[PDB]
């Protein structure tokens, strides 16, 4: 088995696509193994750049192809380089930008924690085995972290494992296990834009909706409920036009649904308080009792949604 040591440098993680559950990573790959001794000009390391690599492969140089098994498409490889030492060592160094996919769950959207993952695996070998994985995310974004969309916690997690492919050759004593390198980078979204421009104003609109119980006429309470209903629709548009698309409801959308429910429940109470001929449009304490019971009932419902997400 040819031992291969790998170092991954991460320069930039960006472009998270929520519907496809993909993200872009730009960085370097440094693979190093040990072949047989060779003679190089000047008995010093020999450097072979981008298009000269292909001429060495045709002459019989063994350069294993390393594939990302989560990449969507083909990574946009930039500059490549080989460094053939006279004692046998070979260092392969490449620049990559690709779109990677992972199971990402945005159900706590403004406060979600993701885990960007890179999986590396030799494309056509089972007994060329990876030993060391060093991940150097040298971008110490701890400084000026508050201007970045994603905060990166911890350094990185590396893991060398053996993946078994049972859908393989009949003769598979050890001919169906492939070495795999997994890199995990934890991240936390930056909940400042979504906490000041989406959640705070939505709390004020819903809070102002309970003001409808302070008007002093049945006709006034009903008519201003439709303006409130139009305000929430105009707010669900401002939200859905900015927030990322998802196949489930986040915590912002569940507040909007509660906004529709609060206004609609107010309309039923306004109508019921007016047309029950036991309190009627005369002295009626159902409205006064509703000035207090509506904020409390909504606050309790806000707690049920706040424990559903955490659990």
């Amino acid at each position: 088995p040819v031992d291969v040591s790998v170092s991954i440098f991460i320069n930039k993680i960006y472009g998270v696509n929520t519907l496809e559950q993909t993200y872009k990573v730009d960085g370097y790959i440094v693979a190093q193994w040990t072949g047989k001794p060779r003679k190089t000009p000047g008995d010093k390391p020999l450097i072979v750049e981008n298009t000269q690599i292909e001429r060495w492969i045709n002459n019989g140089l063994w350069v294993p192809a390393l594939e990302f098994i989560n990449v969507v498409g083909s990574p946009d490889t930039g500059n490549k380089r080989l460094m053939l030492f006279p004692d046998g060592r070979v260092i392969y160094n490449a620049r990559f930008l690709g779109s990677f996919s992972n199971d990402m769950d945005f159900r706590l959207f403004p406060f979600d924690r993701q885990q960007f993952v890179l999986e590396l695996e030799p494309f056509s070998y089972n007994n060329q085995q990876l030993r060391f994985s060093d991940i150097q995310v040298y971008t110490e974004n701890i400084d000026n972290e508050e201007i970045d969309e994603w905060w990166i916690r911890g350094k990185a997690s590396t893991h060398i494992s053996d993946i078994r492919y049972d859908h393989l050759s009949s003769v598979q004593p050890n001919q169906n296990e492939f070495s795999r390198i997994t890199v995990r980078i934890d991240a936390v979204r930056n909940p400042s834009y979504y906490l000041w421009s989406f959640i705070l104003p939505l709390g004020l609109i819903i809070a102002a909706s309970w003001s409808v119980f302070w008007l002093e006429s049945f006709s006034e309470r009903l008519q201003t409920s439709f303006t409130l209903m139009l305000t929430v629709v105009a707010y669900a548009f401002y939200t859905s036009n900015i927030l990322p698309r998802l196949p489930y409801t986040t915590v912002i959308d569940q507040m909007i649904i509660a906004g529709y429910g609060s206004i609609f429940a107010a309309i039923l109470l306004i109508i019921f308080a007016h047309h029950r001929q036991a309190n009627g449009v005369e002295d009626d304490l159902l409205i006064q009792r509703c000035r207090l019971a509506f904020p409390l009932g909504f606050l309790a419902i806000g707690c049920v949604l706040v424990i559903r997400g955490i659990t």
Copy 2:
């Protein structure tokens, strides 16, 4: 006829485009046939990766080109690999990401069932025949299925058939039939975001529109009908800005049309109840009889649309 056995691995189905009726599939192709015996270094399997394949074809190696006849454009092939055994077997292994087209019908949009299809066919041979097709959708997304946009039901359907091209050579005793592999994957859309953020609030807006018959003045009933009309337009915008574009009306759009109709029919009844000098603005039971007849009439219409889609 050279027998070819094919295995397709499906990694990711995503990016459904409703107007073009296309979708993206990423996975592997494994073709295997049996040529003539050859001598390989060490009498062990020989591996030929990406750019070394072209050097073997120039020397006379027979590598048939397999084409997807539903792909839109050219698939973005990544890593390729040949494995030439000494006893004659040849295994071709490639990575593909392409955009595939199929007749997709979204007329039940939030509850539609699709059928993603891959069709494979040799590009230039009629007596190189495919025998086996194994489809391994190993992505057991049954776990964490609720965070995915599409739920995949069943395993997969494979079928090897013979397609006849009558627009072909004059001498076509058997020279116009091509083997074809068809793969079908059933799917069901995830109706949670569209059932809580589009259908439920739309039911509340239309339900609140019937509240206009509880106001106690002709001037009030007419003026609040225009606010309701503005609310539905503001809702048709919030819907059309998120839902996928289609050349027909889905079930959400047919509710919006009923929303316009309900408000417009209310305006005619409000005006007619006021200007018929047989009940007039005095004691008038046409409005009271309309507090009940409007929700029932709309509920019945909702059933007609609910049976049109199923049938």
Copy 3:
């Protein structure tokens, strides 16, 4: 002159871009001519696929380049293939996906008829002449036609003509005429989504705007006219956010302009009926006479626009 027979297969017409007046076509090209007799292995047809074609051209095989003179850019050619018969025949078979441009006129937008056009012409020869053109649009989309955006009427129109380039060599006895193949496919847009979700509700909003003449106060008529004006603006946004961009006004936009005009003309009549001290805010039959004259006047204007488009 080398006679060339051409067959075009059309698989998919989609992606109409209204501003650029381009559309995408995916299909096959089959060119067939007759060269000089050659000797092939086994005295049977010889097949030369994608990258092996270039090795035959370098050895002196004559493969004329056929260009689409309406394509915007360069078509994305997929698989290619040559079939060299021993008696001299050569069949060239390629897969193309390109963006094609034609003079498209959308002035009747929801009911417009287009004409998708493909123009083929040898890139560098004047006495290599095309004789036969067969267009096989085998996609019998007559079934499930109602789920497609474009309905295709008729089969196809083919035409072989000679284009003269006067901007050419001084010696042009016949050295400036190029054979050209023109393919025309008629189509009609699917006017169901645009007839139920854009035209019908717009007719209801404008019809409900004439209800402003049934209110019984000058203050009420004026104030509800501004809500109507806001409704039409909110509707012109919902329309312009979905309809394709164009450099002229379609029939939907001309109804919106009439919507603005009807409301604005109503405001002038409401104000004039109140401030003319010959009928004044007292008994005034100008408003009653306007309950009828407004729908009729608007209906007549709708006919003028309905004959302008047809003519």
Copy 4:
């Protein structure tokens, strides 16, 4: 110096991007010079198409590279062709589609005049000099001009000049001057969609805003001013969602700003006319004097903006 004669054919100008100040041009380049006499098969012109050109360059054929110095990126060259005559002439013919940049000024947006520019220059030669430039915009779009986004006035302007690069070799007696071909095509935007769907309705909304001075109550005048303020915001959204993005204000945006100013100035006058206890809510001719002074003052302001743009 090798004399080079150039002909540019323009097929399509489209895709104007206002923020980047770029546009797309599709057409042909025909370069012709005179080398040394050669012997061709049959003593007739020899044609060398796309990939065979590279084999002639390797054997020492001089084919200068012509670069567009305004192109953003690299043009998407399609088919190429050489025509080597036996008497020495060489004709180079290529198909290009590229994105070109020029200083474009949209400050009169709906009535702006642009000037699409192509600049051509040999990439690495100073004494290979261009003599003739013929620009053949054969697209006589005078017919069906009204369905096109851009109207093209005049034919074309050509100019062969010498550009001096002072940032060049120390020995630059004449080794720093490069021949340059400049092509200019005048154009005028099609002001029909923007004159009927954006300017006319905006004139009606602002005109209807002056109707607020005809209501007969302080409470009514103030409340309907906020509906008008909401209408203009709803209109600035419909405008900014369709008009191209720019780093300055066009003439449409300056009308919207005047719309905000007119409504806001109306609010101050309504409040001031009510709370000055010299005319008060009693008989007050400041409002009546404002029914006339507001349209005139706004008309005069419209003239100041109409002379600022022209000057």
Copy 5:
């Protein structure tokens, strides 16, 4: 060490993407070093263009690969050129268009200052050292500067430094330091569109919101507060649909939040002034005292945000 002198020409800086913190730069690279003397045809400079460069590298010409270490992906290189002098000098000249990333901070969005950065570094050498860097931004955009999105202040800053990579070979006496060229171009955004179409009208809407304290009824003050609340939501949509996406709040968004707060604080005061039975709906000077205290309190808050950004 081989001395390399570099000149960068900048043609166009555009396409700033605020979420990815990237921008596009188009220009030239001119590298010049001195190899060993060679014999050229005619004893004059020899020019080797695009595809002929690769044939010289295969024969042993040393052409170091220069990489941009901030580029996202791979730059779209256009025309290349070598100029081999007989005395040994070699000049490498290339055209590039790439997407570059830098730490960009938009927290003062309409008045932000950016710093576009290009970093150049040899890809595989440590003792090939860069000496001179000349940056020639010849685009004297001082003229017609007001039609450009970005104003460029100063000329350019160049810097040649040594970057140490400690993650490198065990034998690193000097084998881990790489020469680096850094180019910085200061810029200031053009605050005209965002100062007239976003900040001025937002100041008028908030100013008009304080007019609610001049109405003379509790019912009128409350109902027109909800129209104001709808206006601000309709304005936050018009803003968020045009302004660039960011992960923090700019100065425009902080005014919108103050707009929500001002209206919501007004609602509490309106309700409190009506339901405190010490001033009540009778003669109440809390509203009059609020006609003045609201503009002043908001003006002071506007100063706190105006000093937070500067500090």
